[PDB]
């Protein structure tokens, strides 16, 4: 049983060491399942499995965040792996952006300035 | 509009000592050969189905 607050404090090398210890502990409990085992011993299987999941969650969350920052530089963002890019939706990725939309010709731009829409009232 | 008519039923015709009502096709179930498509048959269509107009 490991608290999430302590795990985020540990380093990558420390986390990998703890992952091996819990994996070894779980293997010994599977042996108890095959033979006869006390009910108290068998009740420890679930907490061990959930502790392993927490360690892997912290490792993977840290690794993704570092790589996103590494590729954030303009010189490397053109080669970002597709798993690190935003997903959104297939159609939304190919649609026109707000900047690509709203493009205007010079004549249209000058007309909008010459005759802007007004606010008025009638008495 | 589809209630009671969602079967591929057909009449067996005369020559078999049964009524000429359409009957469910197939086999292997308790509904095989049972009557269908009729206001008097169990699971059949009602007479003059109600409309919304």
């Amino acid at each position: 049983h490991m608290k999430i607050k302590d795990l985020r404090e540990k380093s990558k090398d420390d986390l990998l060491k703890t992952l091996t210890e819990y994996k070894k502990e779980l293997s010994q409990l599977r042996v108890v399942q095959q033979t006869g085992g006390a009910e108290t011993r068998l009740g420890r299987i679930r907490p061990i499995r959930k502790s392993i999941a927490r360690i892997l969650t912290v490792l993977n969350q840290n690794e993704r965040s570092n790589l996103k920052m590494f590729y954030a530089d303009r010189k490397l963002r053109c080669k970002t792996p597709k798993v690190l890019r935003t997903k959104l939706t297939h159609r939304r990725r190919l649609a026109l952006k707000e900047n690509e939309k709203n493009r205007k010709t010079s004549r249209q731009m000058r007309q909008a300035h010459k005759f802007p829409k007004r606010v008025y009232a009638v008495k | 509009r589809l209630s009671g008519m969602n079967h591929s039923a057909h009449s067996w015709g005369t020559g078999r000592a049964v009524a000429r009502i359409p009957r469910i096709s197939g086999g292997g179930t308790s509904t095989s050969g049972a009557g269908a498509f009729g206001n008097m048959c169990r699971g059949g269509r009602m007479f003059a189905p109600t409309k919304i107009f």
Partner: protein
């Protein structure tokens, strides 16, 4: 809520005596009143460049 519209006469000999609202004001009417059509389109006046003003 609704823009300003002109007054027109209904066609044919059956509705000759009736009046109603048309699509928009003509450029000749706008010029007689002293308005640029493009400017008038921005202060809630409808413009129609097809009507003829035959009388």
């Amino acid at each position: 809520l609704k823009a300003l519209r002109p007054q027109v006469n209904c066609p044919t000999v059956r509705h000759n005596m009736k009046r109603r609202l048309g699509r928009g004001f003509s450029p000749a009417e706008l010029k007689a009143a002293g308005l640029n059509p493009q400017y008038a389109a921005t202060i809630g006046i409808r413009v129609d460049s097809r009507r003829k003003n035959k009388s």
